[PDB]
């Protein structure tokens, strides 16, 4: 009886407020992340329109918001933003708004990324937006790093580079390594390597899927190279000899939910040359003994077999499991 009375004292307010707001004449009835950006935009626009002498210039109001977009975009795109006709106070407040929104953007992106890494239950749209934010942040950091390298020069001192090069030269001389020559026009394997290279390029399409324009263009290039192997080989050798400039390559980021793996999209025409070069380089480096056995994977031991062989090698060492004299 007393237990249910103690329940009753607690449950009375709920029922009272649920009833009194129900049989009365008048009835009464993901926002964290989409909070600061919207409030900041509303506040900046309200301030600008308040100080605007809009008795004559109301039609500029929408235009103002457009600036608040482009500046933000120009910050997100890491491109310069300098409107020539924009008055200095307006530009200053737009810059303040962009700085505040950028601080919130960075903090929100990092917080959401840490949530996802921990295992917080999140939606697909949230994941895509967070991945986009992290891609933008990582690319801004990469631009900073590349600019630092260009401005501050190479970070390897001449002494360190000389030591590394001398060690490599001594190693190559010790092993008696003949350098890999340029692929001859009469190469005995100039066609087998080309077929192997084209097969790897077509492996991305082995699973049946709907083809867009870029994919079918790449497949057409591969088919053209296969139909006329010698013309493709001549183009490949010409690119190897004379091509030092290349078109831009796109970058995306595979989201593993614990980190970001960069993914690079290269032009298919350069992809064929790079694939043939990779196949030829690996075939030559396996013909010769360029890579010593301790470099893995070695095409002969799967990683589990690598672990097995490593454990067996540990166990097979001379008196490895001995500690009589304190050896460890």
């Amino acid at each position: 009886w007393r237990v249910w009375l103690f329940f009753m004292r607690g449950i009375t307010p709920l029922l009272e407020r649920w009833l009194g707001n129900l049989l009365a004449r008048q009835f009464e009835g993901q926002r964290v992340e989409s909070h600061f950006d919207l409030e900041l935009r509303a506040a900046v626009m309200h301030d600008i329109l308040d100080m605007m002498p809009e008795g004559i210039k109301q039609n500029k109001a929408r235009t103002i918001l457009q600036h608040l977009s482009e500046a933000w975009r120009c910050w997100k795109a890491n491109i310069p933003w300098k409107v020539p006709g924009l008055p200095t106070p307006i530009e200053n407040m737009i810059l303040r708004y962009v700085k505040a929104k950028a601080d919130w953007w960075t903090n929100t992106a990092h917080y959401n990324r840490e949530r996802i890494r921990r295992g917080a239950t999140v939606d697909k749209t949230v994941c895509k937006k967070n991945l986009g934010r992290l891609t933008r942040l990582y690319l801004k950091a990469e631009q900073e790093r590349q600019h630092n390298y260009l401005k501050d020069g190479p970070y390897i001192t001449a002494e360190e580079a000389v030591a590394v090069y001398t060690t490599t030269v001594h190693w190559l001389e010790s092993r008696r390594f003949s350098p890999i020559p340029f692929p001859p026009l009469s190469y005995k394997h100039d066609t087998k390597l080309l077929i192997l290279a084209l097969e790897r390029l077509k492996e991305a399409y082995s699973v049946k899927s709907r083809l867009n324009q870029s994919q079918r263009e790449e497949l057409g290039l591969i088919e053209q190279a296969y139909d006329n192997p010698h013309e493709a080989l001549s183009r490949i050798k010409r690119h190897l000899l004379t091509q030092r400039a290349f078109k831009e390559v796109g970058i995306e980021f595979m989201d593993l939910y614990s980190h970001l793996v960069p993914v690079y999209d290269v032009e298919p025409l350069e992809k064929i040359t790079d694939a043939y070069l990779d196949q030829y380089l690996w075939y030559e480096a396996d013909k010769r003994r360029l890579f010593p056995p301790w470099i893995k994977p070695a095409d002969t031991e799967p990683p589990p077999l690598l672990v097995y062989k490593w454990c067996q090698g540990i166990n097979n060492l001379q008196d490895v499991w001995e500690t009589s004299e304190g050896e460890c």
Binding site: H46, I48, I56, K60, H67, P87, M93, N212
Partner: protein, 137 residues
Amino acid sequence: FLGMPAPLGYVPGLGRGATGFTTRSDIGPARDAKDDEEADAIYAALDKRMDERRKERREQREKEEIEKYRMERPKIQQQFSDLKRKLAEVTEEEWLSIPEVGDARNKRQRNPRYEKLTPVPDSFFAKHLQTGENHTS
């Protein structure tokens, strides 16, 4: 039309053939088939009197909490107060001189043509079919 006063004696539900809907019975006022307006006030004042137990002692603590929160995180409008003040030096001609924002990207990026999807060539089925055929020696 927009910015037009509602005609007098007009029911917004009527004149349009609108029909309501009820997802449940727990939402909305009860359906209806000067001694009342003087009786609602009695219960309202009774509820206010019952709330008067700690109304001053809880609306004062929330005031200090708001002040403490604003000490560290100021309001957004106050974060632009100086800049908003400095807008008084922008003249009307300067206000009119604000340019319209354009888009840099061209037609191929703004409104690209439809990206037709095409089936994978039959040679892929053929090549997948070639694999699995094993030499007898």
